[PDB]
Amino acid sequence: SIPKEVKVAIVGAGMSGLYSAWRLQSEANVGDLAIFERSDRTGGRLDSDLIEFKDNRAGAGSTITVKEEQGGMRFLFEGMDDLMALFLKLGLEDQIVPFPMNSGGNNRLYFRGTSFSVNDAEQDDYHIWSALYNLDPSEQGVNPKDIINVVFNRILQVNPQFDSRPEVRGPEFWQNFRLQCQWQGEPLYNWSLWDLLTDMGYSQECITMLYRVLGFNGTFLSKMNAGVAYQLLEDFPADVEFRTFKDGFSTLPNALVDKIGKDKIHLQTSIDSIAFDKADSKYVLKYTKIDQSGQVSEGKFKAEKVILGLPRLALEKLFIASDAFKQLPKKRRDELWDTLQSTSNQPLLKINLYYDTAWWGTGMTGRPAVSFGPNFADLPTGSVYPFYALNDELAAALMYDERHATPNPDTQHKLDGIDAAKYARPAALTIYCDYLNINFWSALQNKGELYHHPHESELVESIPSDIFPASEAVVQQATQFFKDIFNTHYVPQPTLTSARIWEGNVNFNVPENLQFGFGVHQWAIGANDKEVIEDLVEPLPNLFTCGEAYSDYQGWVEGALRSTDLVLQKGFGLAPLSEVYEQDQGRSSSEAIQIAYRKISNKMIMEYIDPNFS
């Protein structure tokens, strides 16, 4: 049942769509809204998986849960005040769990046919990098990642007009940085990073090292401008304490869905086009719906206000097919289209391979054990992240670890046993790559038969619906690369796999369960994103756009939430959530979230690690 008129119609059940409805329902008393989502699931580019593997250990119908991510995975307590506030208001802070990013130096590196570890790379004044890359002398004997840091310091040094001092560096800093800082008279958003480093005098060998060693070469090789690329590159300092949700980032959209109500969300309902009814001053939304049989249905309805929570490629399709846009004057319709072109589409992929046990610990490799964080490579792999079966004791050990406490031998010995025990429980690896590496996996994933371990139903009885298997060719090649990266002869066959390629499609011959938007977005060269962002709040009267694609904080949910807030302000009077939080609570969401988390971490550690802890 689809209503025939609504106060607010919400296109997109991703984060910005779900977030608009919750805030309008609860803070603006608007109850006659509806969300329309083309796919058969809510959450968009957030998509966690919970697999319940048959516990087939020796002394075991017992079940073991592994959380994995097909989309978004991590967040931070600083710089995401809207997201923190959103977590606190939904009471989801008790589920917050560490997301660690290193293995004390044992994370892997594979570059130019050579497998080694992070600790290895540091030896002898970072010698290995000088042996693999034909570096200029000024480029030798330093950690590659510190070259990005130094160049940032140099950009800040020659831009004293730009304040450069707020200890917490949020989206305003990064907007001003890319819009106000210059290099040699040209502001950074007119620069490509590749051009920038080159003009700074770096070798092409050095630039290739950097974009391979950071794992996400889009920052250098795509059309994104240099300013926004730095925002992304300085999002992962050495000392990052990322966090995540125990049951996966989907916890947050599902939690919003409980509060919205399944009855106002209309899945498998694509909004095909939008027209304006001059008579009763209403929008008219043509749609296409698939029921629970597969029986299609074209229909139409009205709405006083429209909210498009949609990324760039979705927004161009509607614009193309919508009379509300086509009947605009030549000048502004062309200007609006050109404005959609101002953020670059960034392809991303994640392929998850699950295993009954993990094979990258010292017991299986004979080498120092790999635990957590990106294993980078110049192979099509890009980066590889390990994921372990959910375990309360392990999360407390991780929680102890993000305190830089000095354990006594008793506690070091218990942390030892915990670090090792996880390799005996099921686990997973995510291959996570961007720009240059996409086409390698693309062609591989679409060729040949799909991968299924035999007696698969014996290994998992309930395979989630958002899981499309990796192709046999994808598993085959991914397995050779793992042997390379982890320097081991032994990489067994996965029990279960999923492949997800966030790269937007314009082909009508693709099932809906395989249509996915561009993984992330970043501002192109020449883009004045301050003008672009404000133009796209309400481009036609009572028609709004918002979401991550044209946001202040591209790449992150906070981008979507801050973009939506502009719509909720301009169209509905609502102040930014973080500001609403602070008036209501008397402290920031930052301080609240840190205090709440320290408490449950304090309790977790004492309960599991060191009964006599600080």
The residues that touch ligand FAD, with contacts defined as CB under 6 A, are 11-17, 36-39, 44-46, 71-75, 270-271, 309-311, 314, 348, 350, 502, 517, 519-520, 547-548, 555-557, 559-560
Give the footprint of ligand TRP on residues 527-556 (CB under 6 A): 555-556
383 binds ligand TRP (CB under 6 A): no
489 binds a second copy (CB under 8 A): no
> In whole angstroms, how far apart are CA 114 and each of 129, 394, 487?
11, 32, 9
On whether the CB atoms of residues 140 and 408 are closer than 8 A, the answer is no
**String marking each residue 443-482 x if it binds a second copy according to CB under 8 A:** xx-xxx------------------------x--xx-----
Residues 6+ apart with CB under 8 A from 408: none
Q: Which is nearer to ligand FAD, 567 or 609 (CB)?
A: 567
CA distance 86 to 580: 11
Residue type, 70: Q
On whether the CB atoms of residues 560 and 19 are closer than 8 A, the answer is yes
The residue with tokens 């249509």 is 515
CA distance 332 to 339: 10
216 binds ligand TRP (CB under 6 A): yes
CA distance 290 to 198: 52
Tokens of residue 60, six digits: 């075991």
Closest of 293, 256, 235 to residue 86, by C-alpha: 256
**How many Cβ atoms from other residues are within 10 Å of residue 404's Cβ?**
6
CB closest to ligand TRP, residue no:
555
324 binds a second copy (CB under 8 A): no
490 binds a second copy (CB under 8 A): no
Residue selected from 73, 310, 398, 460 as contacting ligand TRP according to rule CB under 6 A: 73
Give the nearest distance from C-beta 553 to ligand TRP in angstroms: 9
Dihedral through CA 349, CA 355, CA 357, CA 363, nearest 10? -60
Residues 6+ apart with CB under 8 A from 77: 84, 241, 243, 590, 593, 594, 597
Q: Which is nearer to ligand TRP, 117 or 346 (CB)?
A: 346
With CB under 5 to 8 Å by kind, the binding choice for 337 among ligand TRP, a second copy, ligand FAD, none is a second copy
Give the nearest distance from C-beta 117 to ligand FAD in angstroms: 25
Handedness of CA 291, 517, 380, 231 (dihedral sign): negative
On whether the CB atoms of residues 316 and 554 are closer than 8 A, the answer is no
Strand 186-187 relative to strand 182-183, pairing: antiparallel
74 binds ligand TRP (CB under 6 A): yes
Residues 6+ apart with CB under 8 A from 227: 174, 177, 178, 179, 181, 187, 188, 189, 191, 523
Give the nearest distance from C-beta 15 to ligand TRP in angstroms: 13
Q: Which is nearer to ligand FAD, 425 or 562 (CB)?
A: 562
**String marking each residue 276-315 x if it binds a second copy according to CB under 8 A:** ----------------------------------------
372 binds ligand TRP (CB under 6 A): no
2 binds a second copy (CB under 8 A): no
Give the nearest distance from C-beta 250 to a second copy in angstroms: 31
With CB under 5 to 8 Å by kind, the binding choice for 161 among a second copy, ligand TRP, ligand FAD, none is none
Binders of ligand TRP: how many residues, by CB under 6 A? 10
Strand 265-266 relative to strand 33-36, pairing: parallel
- The H helix count followed by the E strand count for the chain is 23, 22
Q: Which is nearer to ligand FAD, 371 or 383 (CB)?
A: 383
185 binds a second copy (CB under 8 A): yes
511 binds a second copy (CB under 8 A): no
Give the footprint of ligand TRP on residues 232-251 (CB under 6 A): 232
CA distance 87 to 250: 12
526 binds a second copy (CB under 8 A): yes
Handedness of CA 73, 76, 77, 81 (dihedral sign): negative
223 binds ligand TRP (CB under 6 A): no
With CB under 5 to 8 Å by kind, the binding choice for 223 among ligand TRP, ligand FAD, a second copy, none is a second copy
With CB under 5 to 8 Å by kind, the binding choice for 44 among a second copy, ligand FAD, ligand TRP, none is ligand FAD
Closest of 204, 234, 32, 65 to residue 133, by C-alpha: 204
Closest of 482, 474, 481 to residue 359, by C-alpha: 482
**What is the binding site for a second copy (CB under 8 A)?**
112-114, 133-135, 185-186, 190-192, 194-195, 198-199, 203-205, 221-223, 225, 320, 334-335, 337-338, 341, 378-380, 436, 439-440, 442-444, 446-448, 473, 476-477, 506-509, 525-526
- Report the interface residues with ligand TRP, using CB under 6 A: 73-74, 216, 218, 232, 346, 434, 520, 555-556
